[PDB]
Amino acid sequence: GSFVGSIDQGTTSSRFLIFNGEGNPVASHQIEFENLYPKSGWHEQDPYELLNSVQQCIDGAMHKFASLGYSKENIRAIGITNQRETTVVWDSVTGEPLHNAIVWPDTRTSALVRELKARQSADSLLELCGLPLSTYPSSVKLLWLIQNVDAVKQAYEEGRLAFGTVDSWLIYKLNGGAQAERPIHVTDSTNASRTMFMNLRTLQYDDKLLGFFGIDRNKIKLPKIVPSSDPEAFGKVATGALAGVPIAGCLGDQSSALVGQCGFSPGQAKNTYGTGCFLLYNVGTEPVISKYGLLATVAYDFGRGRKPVYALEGSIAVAGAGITFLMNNLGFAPKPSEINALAESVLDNGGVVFVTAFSGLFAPYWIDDAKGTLFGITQHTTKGHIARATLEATCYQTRAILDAMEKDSGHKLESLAVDGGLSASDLCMQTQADISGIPVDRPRMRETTALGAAIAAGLATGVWRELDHVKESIAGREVFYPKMDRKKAERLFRKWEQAVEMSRGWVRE
Amino acid sequence: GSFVGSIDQGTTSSRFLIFNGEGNPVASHQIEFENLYPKSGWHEQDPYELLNSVQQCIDGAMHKFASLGYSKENIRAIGITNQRETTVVWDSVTGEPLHNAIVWPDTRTSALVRELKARQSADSLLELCGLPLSTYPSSVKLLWLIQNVDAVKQAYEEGRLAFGTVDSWLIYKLNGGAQAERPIHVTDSTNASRTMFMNLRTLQYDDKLLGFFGIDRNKIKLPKIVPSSDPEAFGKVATGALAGVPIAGCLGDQSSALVGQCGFSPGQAKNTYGTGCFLLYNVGTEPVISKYGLLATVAYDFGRGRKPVYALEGSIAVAGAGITFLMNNLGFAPKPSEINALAESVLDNGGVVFVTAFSGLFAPYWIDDAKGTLFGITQHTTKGHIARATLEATCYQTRAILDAMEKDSGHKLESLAVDGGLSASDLCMQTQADISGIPVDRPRMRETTALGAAIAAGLATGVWRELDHVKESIAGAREVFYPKMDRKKAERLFRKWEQAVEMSRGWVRE
């Protein structure tokens, strides 16, 4: 086959895309599924809601694939990319879930996180797995379920509990789950580096990480850790429109976006804009443990005599959310297109600085007692100035994270690719280039995340032979270049840093 | 004669009102006049623009007075109240102005005040006149004119330069000016305490004050300082619809407001809401020199048989301006009415605090390197919350100033009366009561400033015999807002305000 498919299983969305050898999607289908919020801070999904949405997107895309004269014979393989950390538990014997998936934003584990941080050896986990303790990793979600949901506890104690991130669950069921010969219970190194069970350097489950959380290896069934690109580890789709088509790629969704942007060299970074931001920074074959609260994770692992590549990761809470705040909360304008117009309406920020720390500031500032704080207001401040400061806020924090990634890794920032929500704003992307002093590359093929999984599967099956082949095949309103004098750029950043400094201490108990 | 007229000459508008014995206006007329802004920071008025606007208001109001069947035969006297500091210079022989009036917000004296602040003896001015050096007092404006307007240079050196605040210019001209027999060149104690020429304790021109600025008393003609209520010192209207009616009252406008609210006892205070705020605090018969940058001024001086009364004054730059900012700059709503509505749409400030320091903060903070700074924003913050915070900002600053006046004077806060612009917001004033822990009196008759000058003229001429007669006559939407909030919540919200203020200083760099 000449085409490659890509399952993109998201937090709010599932979709299937079929790419050609030049990385362009020829057929696609997207479905918004149900998310469940039982309590405040609780976030759950029916595991079958994830699967069935994927399956319908597969069917939907292949009907339009048929309308252009192709069949599953034309697809050489498919890759999977998925929301990370989201924790799924099922019965190893039946393959049926024992509880709804706990989605990555779920906060029901705070108390447990507090307890675990006080435990002995909690100091050592960052160095082992790349991540600190928080509500996010799958380790604490799974531990919570074992201690609070009893169908899970007894499954565990009886040796029939299976754990999986959403990739593992989808691969397991798409291969036929329990009912099938050679059942596939696997996860790729990227997804696996998000749990806190995997030694980041060896890419193997570590007994000291598993021991810290109290999960017994020979009682629970963990997914075998395999490369993100492999022609046989992931099995094949058992039934349906893709019956018999191999799965050959598997990547956590943020890693997939880095791959889709061809960020294959150290110093190459990406930012995905949504309600917030996820930033990843290729740091090469050698892992880096951050000194500024960045996450150390696997960028991609392509097996074939390939040394796995690592990344540093940072996040921003308020990006697109800031635009939503200007539209709905303040009534500046009803659509984001017009917020950008307001920002372009004025020459500069009018001295305005908006520290958008709605829920505090994360890496590298780590300021939890700040709230949204707007500086520089006068009688002559207008909506346009505030709109600019809102866009500038994300670029300032983006630079702050990229700068921290530079000092941690010692690899000079070489490029920044962007995709999703705010990346469409020409003004803010230009501002990012100006502030950071680096070109901002924005592809007009907008399905970068899905493209990453296609590349992984395509490499496993020879659609592309090397990453150099990938970049030039994919290569064949796209790049913003620094145009601001660097003195003005440093001035603007220093008053950002200052606004931040004055924002700390606002929330007193 | 049983009615009393009032000339209210303001910064943008003049007005003439006729009050009855109970303090209600029976006829009124207002005219917006022309203000000139030649340079950035320069504010001028044609002195005849203010005189004729007054004359037109008099004509307009008297026609309405005639519609009710009355004439000047029914008006016992009139009083004047005026924008303060606004400086007028005219020629002593001809009575015509030698330059445009420099109005109080004018900033052309920045340089001159910078040098004067560096002159030795400058440290002594506040203790003598109650004011510090700044762009506002008449002293720096007059000195500037003599040093930069050669027509006034020559008039001074020729001994034919006359100086006057707006009150003295109007009284002078309404009496006949140069041509009249018994020409009147006077100013009341309040307007005179805004000059920096007057010793505040003696209410006499002081040679040390005049000497500091280089003004020679035997070469310029200074207006004779007279009481704010006097049956003869102000003369009479020479011409027109009120020909022959005596002038018997004269008060600086913010002093007039305090009088109109009947703030005659120590601890009684008033706030006048406009684009900003003007607060005066009655401190009794002996002046108080502030330790918090407040101004020591004459509250009112009702002449023979009465000891002059003094006051502490503070100001807030942004009050109604904050509501304008929400409507025009942010598009929250097109009318002030509906900004209140949004603020009432929410239960509280949502954790929001708006340090409305667009031009820094004045008394008691004195922070020049802050700007407008909004705190406590989240995804759940709404226009209503920010509206509340904007109203609350004026209440927090109002309390801050009243707190300073208490510590300066040692007189417990007894009363707070309110008038003008933002005082119409039921929510803003209820909040003021909550934050300050005292009832807030809001009169239904909303021409409080003009009534102050009527009271002075009425007292001078026996329309009212004593100040308790005044209080009794006058006190005879809502009127009074009482504290509803628990004291602890009020202190918590103030300390949050103080915190926000403290975190906004240092924004501007130099």
Author numbering:
A (entry chain D): 65 to 540, 551 to 583
B (entry chain A): 65 to 540, 550 to 583
Verbatim from the authors:
Here, we report the first structure of glycerol kinase from the thermophilic filamentous fungus Chaetomium thermophilum (CtGK). Overall, the CtGK polypeptide chain can be divided into two distinct domains classified by Pfam as FGGY_N (residues 65–325) and FGGY_C (residues 331–583) connected by a flexible region.
In total, three different crystal structures were obtained in the presence of glycerol, constituting 13 polypeptide chains. Generally, the same extent of the chain could be modeled as in the apo structures, i.e., for residues 65–583 with an approximate 9aa gap between H18 and B18. The substrate is bound in an evolutionarily conserved cleft within the N-terminal domain that opens towards the C-terminal domain. The glycerol molecule is coordinated by polar interactions with side chains of Glu149, Arg 148, Asp317, Gln318, and additionally with Arg148 main-chain amide. A similar mode of binding was described previously for P. falciparum GK, where Phe271 and Tyr135 undergo shift upon substrate or cofactor binding. We observed that in the absence of nucleotide, CtGK adopts open conformation, which upon nucleotide binding closes up.
